[PDB]
Swiss-Prot record:
Any one cellular-component term (Gene Ontology): ribonuclease P complex
GO molecular function list: 3'-tRNA processing endoribonuclease activity; anion binding; chloride ion binding; DNA binding; molecular adaptor activity; phosphate ion binding; ribonuclease P activity; ribonuclease P RNA binding
Enzyme Commission (EC) number: 3.1.26.5
Protein name: Ribonuclease P protein component
Function description: RNaseP catalyzes the removal of the 5'-leader sequence from pre-tRNA to produce the mature 5'-terminus. It can also cleave other RNA substrates such as 4.5S RNA. The protein component plays an auxiliary but essential role in vivo by binding to the 5'-leader sequence and broadening the substrate specificity of the ribozyme.
Pfam families to which the protein is assigned, alphabetical: Ribonuclease_P
A biological process term (GO) from this entry: tRNA 3'-end processing
Matching InterPro entries: Ribosomal_Su5_D2-typ_SF, Ribsml_uS5_D2-typ_fold_subgr, RNase_P, RNase_P_CS
Taxonomic superkingdom: Bacteria
Organism expressing this protein natively: Bacillus subtilis (strain 168)
Assembly with partners or alone: Consists of a catalytic RNA component (M1 or rnpB) and a protein subunit. Might be a component of the prossible RNA degradosome complex composed of rny, rnjA, rnjB, pnp, pfkA and eno, and possibly also rnpA. Interacts with RNA helicase CshA.
Underlying gene: rnpA
Entry's family note: Belongs to the RnpA family.
Catalytic reaction(s) noted: Endonucleolytic cleavage of RNA, removing 5'-extranucleotides from tRNA precursor
Amino acid sequence: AHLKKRNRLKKNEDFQKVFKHGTSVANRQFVLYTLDQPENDELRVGLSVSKKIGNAVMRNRIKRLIRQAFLEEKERLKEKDYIIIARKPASQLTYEETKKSLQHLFRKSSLYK
Ligand SMILES: [Zn+2]
Ligand SMILES: [Zn+2]
């Protein structure tokens, strides 16, 4: 039901690494940063939510949808490091809508085995 701990990019150092050296694709809804770790056997997801969405509830909600959207995809996705920045126009998406969006970027940055 939930994304495993090991599949989560926790601390800032890891993020900065992806930002500075990773690759990027952007949507009207999200900015997906994917670094690359050949030394990682499983993928990692980091979440950055605009914060220009104030309601912790809208932010926590959107995070869950992306995390859960990833769970549905953990198998078809390369084992890299991902950072998804949720843009303002993502705040009101439904799971289905979020998943279609993430797969736009995933198909863009060819992160599909
Ligand atoms: Zn550098
Ligand atoms: Zn590394």
